[PDB]
Scaffold this motif. Sequence first.
Motif, PDB file in Angstrom:
ATOM      1  N   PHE A 196       0.859  -1.218   0.000  1.00 18.00           N
ATOM      2  CA  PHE A 196       0.000   0.000   0.000  1.00 18.00           C
ATOM      3  C   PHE A 196       0.884   1.254   0.000  1.00 18.00           C
ATOM      4  O   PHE A 196       0.453   2.259  -0.571  1.00 18.00           O
ATOM      5  CB  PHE A 196      -1.058  -0.065   1.105  1.00 18.00           C
ATOM      6  CG  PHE A 196      -2.280  -0.856   0.710  1.00 18.00           C
ATOM      7  CD1 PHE A 196      -3.334  -0.260   0.028  1.00 18.00           C
ATOM      8  CD2 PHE A 196      -2.357  -2.216   0.979  1.00 18.00           C
ATOM      9  CE1 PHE A 196      -4.444  -1.001  -0.355  1.00 18.00           C
ATOM     10  CE2 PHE A 196      -3.466  -2.956   0.593  1.00 18.00           C
ATOM     11  CZ  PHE A 196      -4.509  -2.348  -0.071  1.00 18.00           C
ATOM     12  N   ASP A 236     -12.163  -5.321  -5.034  1.00 16.84           N
ATOM     13  CA  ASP A 236     -12.649  -3.904  -5.054  1.00 16.84           C
ATOM     14  C   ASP A 236     -13.677  -3.674  -6.181  1.00 16.84           C
ATOM     15  O   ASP A 236     -14.618  -2.870  -5.992  1.00 16.84           O
ATOM     16  CB  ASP A 236     -11.508  -2.927  -5.370  1.00 16.84           C
ATOM     17  CG  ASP A 236     -10.810  -2.271  -4.193  1.00 16.84           C
ATOM     18  OD1 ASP A 236     -11.407  -2.332  -3.118  1.00 16.84           O
ATOM     19  OD2 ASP A 236      -9.672  -1.631  -4.409  1.00 16.84           O
ATOM     20  N   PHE A 280     -10.053  -4.615   5.408  1.00 20.08           N
ATOM     21  CA  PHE A 280     -10.056  -3.143   5.188  1.00 20.08           C
ATOM     22  C   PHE A 280     -10.510  -2.850   3.752  1.00 20.08           C
ATOM     23  O   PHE A 280     -11.738  -2.916   3.520  1.00 20.08           O
ATOM     24  CB  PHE A 280      -8.680  -2.542   5.494  1.00 20.08           C
ATOM     25  CG  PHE A 280      -8.133  -2.822   6.873  1.00 20.08           C
ATOM     26  CD1 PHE A 280      -8.908  -3.426   7.858  1.00 20.08           C
ATOM     27  CD2 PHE A 280      -6.838  -2.445   7.199  1.00 20.08           C
ATOM     28  CE1 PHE A 280      -8.393  -3.669   9.122  1.00 20.08           C
ATOM     29  CE2 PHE A 280      -6.328  -2.680   8.467  1.00 20.08           C
ATOM     30  CZ  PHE A 280      -7.104  -3.293   9.424  1.00 20.08           C
TER      31      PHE A 280
HETATM   32  C1  LIG Z   1      -7.802   1.859  -0.280  1.00 17.73           C
HETATM   33  C2  LIG Z   1      -7.378   0.688   0.556  1.00 17.73           C
HETATM   34  N1  LIG Z   1      -6.274   0.881   1.463  1.00 17.73           N
HETATM   35  C3  LIG Z   1      -5.923  -0.226   2.213  1.00 17.73           C
HETATM   36  C4  LIG Z   1      -4.862  -0.282   3.190  1.00 17.73           C
HETATM   37  C5  LIG Z   1      -4.373   0.902   3.844  1.00 17.73           C
HETATM   38  C6  LIG Z   1      -3.328   0.823   4.816  1.00 17.73           C
HETATM   39  N2  LIG Z   1      -2.755  -0.377   5.149  1.00 17.73           N
HETATM   40  C7  LIG Z   1      -3.191  -1.546   4.540  1.00 17.73           C
HETATM   41  C8  LIG Z   1      -4.246  -1.509   3.568  1.00 17.73           C
HETATM   42  S1  LIG Z   1      -7.063  -1.564   1.730  1.00 17.73           S
HETATM   43  C9  LIG Z   1      -7.955  -0.591   0.548  1.00 17.73           C
HETATM   44  C10 LIG Z   1      -9.101  -1.043  -0.298  1.00 17.73           C
HETATM   45  N3  LIG Z   1      -8.980  -0.558  -1.751  1.00 17.73           N
END
Ligand SMILES: Cc1nc(-c2ccncc2)sc1CN
Length: 280
Positions: A196, A236, A280
Amino acid sequence: MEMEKEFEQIDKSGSWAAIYQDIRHEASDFPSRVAKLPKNKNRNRYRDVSPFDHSRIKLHQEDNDYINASLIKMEEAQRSYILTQGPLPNTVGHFWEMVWEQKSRGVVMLNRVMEKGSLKCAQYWPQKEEKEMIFEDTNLKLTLISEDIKSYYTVRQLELENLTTQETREILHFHYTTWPDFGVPESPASFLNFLFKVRESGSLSPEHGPVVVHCSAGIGRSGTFCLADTCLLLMDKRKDPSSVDIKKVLLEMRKFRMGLIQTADQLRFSYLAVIEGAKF
Ligand SMILES: Cc1nc(-c2ccncc2)sc1CN
């Protein structure tokens, strides 16, 4: 079948080895004739790991266009990745030529230069601001701009200069530094945090050329990175996220590069990453 349920079903039955061998049996087999030419023997780190002719990256030169690198194009997810081996002493110039020609914004590195007391890839980037690297065979200059060292990964800002035209670009180097010498990490939390951090950079986005991803051979850890990314993106996008079949995505990706996911432990880890990632 909800991946999490299939997971507990394989775990309780201990059939990871048997699932993994079914994938190996059904995987695509295409010709790799350019990789096996005698003029290319010193361009290959491993004799049993070659790019397919239909999907290989071509260098833009008339001499020899060959590099051990493949374009993985995921049509429904709308993502592309270049998977390549760790560069060799005689292919460091080819590597940066490819990054330049393909308009990549990011390089993802999933190994250390030395592991298990042996060299897994060349020291292909500069370690000090004031000691830049020049690749005379491909006419490129590389400078370290800045370095951010964290517990599980390091991010570097690099400047790549085409000495022929004096154009420059900023390349981001994402270096995952804590994958263990044997086996796979116990928890994917730090791997998912890395994926990420790369994502947030813009390196995986369609306004740039494909991200370049490598480990030592460019199939194992490298396989895990692109399988987890694509699987989460599909969860998603789709109306039914449970429809995402991790085994079918892996066989689609294996149409573009052989051997992606090297062990049954790497396949179990891939499942773990997409299950915890989903929440998440
Ligand atoms: C936008 C998004 N961001 C995620 C994330 C953020 C921080 N650490 C781990 C995962 S999952 C997700 C679903 N599109």
